[PDB]
Each structure stands twice: as structure tokens, then as C-alpha cells.
């Protein structure tokens, strides 16, 4: 359906409001959108191995 918010990226499944570099929704975009890839998880570590004490 059509509503009247305001975005900067649009796909046929809906709109997107993010600043992450990758994207997973749909490959047909209008506006300025993050890049479509064919993956499911791109978590990136900034920290230590969580080794609890015994």
C-alpha cells in the first residue's frame, strides 16, 4: 500500500531507514541505498573473546 512518510531509499517490499553498508531485502532500489548482497549474517567483532572464569 501507499502511505505518506518520507524516505531516501525504496524497494518493492518497502522502505529502508539505515546507514549500514550492506543490505538484504531486495535488489531493485530507488534512491540512495546500501548495497545488496546474498548473505544472512555479517556480524563483525570489536572486542575480546568472552572467556568467563571458573
Amino acid at each position: 500500500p501507499v502511505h505518506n512518510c518520507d524516505t531516501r531509499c525504496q524497494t518493492p517490499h518497502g522502505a529502508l531507514n539505515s546507514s549500514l553498508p550492506f543490505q538484504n531485502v531486495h535488489p531493485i532500489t530507488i534512491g540512495e541505498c546500501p548495497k545488496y548482497v546474498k548473505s544472512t549474517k555479517l556480524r563483525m567483532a570489536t572486542g575480546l573473546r568472552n572467556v568467563p572464569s571458573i
Binding site: E32, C33, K38, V51
Partner: protein
């Protein structure tokens, strides 16, 4: 490679330490410890922040990409178009996954290196009067209070202040 500190000669982490990544644990005459080391952890935060921002800013955003249309006598061009789209998609998904997988070993080894260097510094400025005992602990033949604790922490220990007195106690135990 693995530098040998995290889950190595040092055992598991400290839950009770909050305000940093690398710190100390001291037991002088009037208290217990858990103070962080604000010098090295700031360098770690700077490095990791620059790394994440670099990885973000190498990837350009894409502009409008809308499908095209072909009739029944342009099958050849249509297959060419589909080939181009699938090729570029495979290349970018490969680059993304491979970049994340290599960056993760890089960052874990970075933390491991920081812990090892923070141990070597403390060992190097306590040359004779320490008697290290295991999993990164030392034990002060002489007597220490809060001031020599901070003196160790900052990196200003002035060993020749204590060098004689420690010696006495060492020869007591030997």
C-alpha cells in the same frame, strides 16, 4: 598468530572489572583492586574505531537500479543482462564475506597482542624485586602501598628506591 595470553598462560577474564578492557588487580595493606589501564585501552578504542570507519567508507552506496523489459525476439540480450547482474552480485557477496572473515582474526590477535605487551611492560619495570608466581601475578619482596601501586600503573617505578631492602628479604627466603 596466537600471541599466547588470552585463554593462554592467563586464565579467563574478570567480570568484576567494568570501565575498560585491560587492567590490574592489587592487594596492598588496605584493599583489593580492579583498576583499569586507561592508557592502552584508549589506543585499542582508537584503532578499532578507525578500522570500522574505514570498512564502512570503502563501500560505496548504490543508486537507482530498475529492471528492464524485452520482447520475444530479444532473448539473447535478455540473457546477457541477467548474466551481468548475477556476476556482479556474486563478486560483491564474495568480497563482503571474505573481508569480514579475515578482519575477525586480525582484531582478535590485536587484543591478544595488547595483553601480552601490557604484561611484558610490568615485568620489565620490576626486574629483580617481584618473584612472578603464575598466570600473570607478581609478589613484591619489599612492602608496597597505594603510591607504589600508582607508580607501577603510570610507568614510573624508580626501582633503586627499593633495590636494597627487597634484596634483604630475598636473602631471607633463600
Amino acid at each position: 598468530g596466537l600471541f599466547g595470553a588470552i585463554a593462554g598462560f592467563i586464565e579467563g577474564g574478570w567480570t568484576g572489572m567494568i570501565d575498560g578492557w585491560y587492567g590490574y588487580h592489587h592487594q596492598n595493606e588496605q584493599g583489593s583492586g580492579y583498576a583499569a589501564d586507561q592508557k592502552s585501552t584508549q589506543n585499542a578504542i582508537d584503532g578499532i574505531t578507525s578500522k570500522v570507519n574505514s570498512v564502512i567508507e570503502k563501500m560505496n552506496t548504490q543508486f537507482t537500479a530498475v529492471g528492464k523489459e524485452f520482447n520475444n525476439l530479444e532473448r539473447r540480450i535478455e540473457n546477457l543482462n541477467k548474466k551481468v547482474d548475477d556476476g556482479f552480485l556474486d563478486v560483491w557477496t564474495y568480497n563482503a564475506e571474505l573481508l569480514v572473515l579475515l578482519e575477525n582474526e586480525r582484531t582478535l590477535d590485536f587484543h591478544d597482542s595488547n595483553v601480552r605487551n601490557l604484561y611484558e611492560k610490568v615485568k620489565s619495570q620490576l626486574r629483580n624485586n617481584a618473584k612472578e608466581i603464575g598466570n600473570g601475578c607478581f609478589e613484591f619482596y619489599h612492602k608496597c602501598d597505594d603510591e607504589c601501586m600508582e607508580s607501577v600503573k603510570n610507568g614510573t617505578y624508580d626501582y633503586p628506591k627499593y633495590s636494597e631492602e627487597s634484596k634483604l628479604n630475598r636473602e631471607e627466603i633463600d
